C-alpha cells in the first residue's frame, strides 16, 4: 500500500 502511493506520486 505504502509503495503504491509512492509510485503514484
Per-residue b or e along 1-9, where b marks 16 or more CB atoms closer than 10 Å to that residue's CB = eeeeeeeee
CA–CA dist 8, 1 (Å, integer):
11
Strand locations in the chain (E): none
Return the SS3 of 6. helix
Q: Resolution limit in angstroms?
A: 1.0
- Residue 2 C-alpha cell reads as 505504502
Q: What is the DSSP string of 1-9?
A: -HHHHHHH-
- Residue 3 C-alpha cell reads as 509503495
Amino acid at each position: 500500500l505504502a509503495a503504491a502511493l509512492c509510485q503514484a506520486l
